[PDB]
Design a protein around this ligand. Structure first.
Ligand SMILES: COc1cccc([C@@H](Oc2ccc3c(cnn3-c3ccc(F)cc3)c2)[C@H](C)NC(=O)C(F)(F)F)c1
Lengths: 248, 13
């Protein structure tokens, strides 16, 4: 019987390439377009990933759709932060091996306003020295971080699944053997970072929603992202979101 | 409504 965290580890998505032509000069519009197209492919891989998370496919099909639609940006910002934290201790965003947002790219007009929210995530993972096992538990928890204000169809089963992954995070913390009081502080710190992802995501979504709606910017979004954004905009307008928190 | 997402969840991987 393999451990739950080992089942989350084996389903880690493959690293995707942007297909970014480095011989042509850079621009924020060019990079933003390429990253949106790459983002759609990341989200298609995220559906495959979520379907293999133990318990996820036992939820009502509508709840599966709901959870991926609320959490999409949280998953993407967190997975990006981890990849950026692993490649370097520098201020780099590793979106793809062929498309890294370096210091030169960060100075491109308007590049930083969106990239800073992503930089915060990698900065925090580096500051807290988050482990691979802690990260895997945390990323599954982000998929389960928001629900509709009237709840899910399989709400009882969801609460059971969420509790199981909270317990898995606790087990990952204990493995990094420190005194009982230090493990209490670590759980507090990592769950505080999880809570702060709602604000990181709110900032990313504010800019993302505006960019998608303003057709005069000519910023293309692939079908996968356009569909998620089209679904999510009216949900935020009608207050149809309950952001789950560990602290208050 | 959310045609693509529904297709990806319902199809066999
Ligand atoms: C400057 O361009 C952007 C800056 C920020 C965000 C974005 C896009 O999000 C992501 C987010 C994560 C993304 C991608 C592509 N790959 N990964 C990724 C995930 C996991 C991982 F491990 C490695 C890589 C696109 C959004 C939709 N687009 C806008 O917010 C808007 F800028 F277009 F408005 C564009």
């Amino acid at each position: 019987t393999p451990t739950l965290v080992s089942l989350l580890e084996v389903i880690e998505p493959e690293v995707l390439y942007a297909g970014y032509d480095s011989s042509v000069p850079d621009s924020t519009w060019r990079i933003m377009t390429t990253l949106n197209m790459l983002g759609g492919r990341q989200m298609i891989a995220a559906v495959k990933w979520a379907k293999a998370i133990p318990g996820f496919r036992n939820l009502h099909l509508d709840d599966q759709m709901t959870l991926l639609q609320y959490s999409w940006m949280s998953l993407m910002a967190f997975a990006l932060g981890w990849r950026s934290y692993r490649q370097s201790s520098a201020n780099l965003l590793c979106f793809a091996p062929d498309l890294i947002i370096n210091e030169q790219r960060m100075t491109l007009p308007d590049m930083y306003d969106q990239c800073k929210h992503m930089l915060y995530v990698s900065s925090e993972l580096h500051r807290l020295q988050v482990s691979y096992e802690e990260y895997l538990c945390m990323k599954t928890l982000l998929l389960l971080s928001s629900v509709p204000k009237d709840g899910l169809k399989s709400q009882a089963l969801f609460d059971e699944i969420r509790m199981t992954y909270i317990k898995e995070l606790g087990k990952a913390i204990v493995k990094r053997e420190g005194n009982s009081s230090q493990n209490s502080q670590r759980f507090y710190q990592l769950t505080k970072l999880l809570d702060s992802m709602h604000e990181v995501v709110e900032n990313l979504l504010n800019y993302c929603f505006q960019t998608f709606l303003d057709k005069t910017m000519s910023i293309e979004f692939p079908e996968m992202l356009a569909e998620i954004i089209t679904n999510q905009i009216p949900k935020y307008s009608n207050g149809n979101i309950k952001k789950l928190l560990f602290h208050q | 409504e959310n045609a693509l997402l529904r297709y990806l969840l319902d199809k066999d991987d």
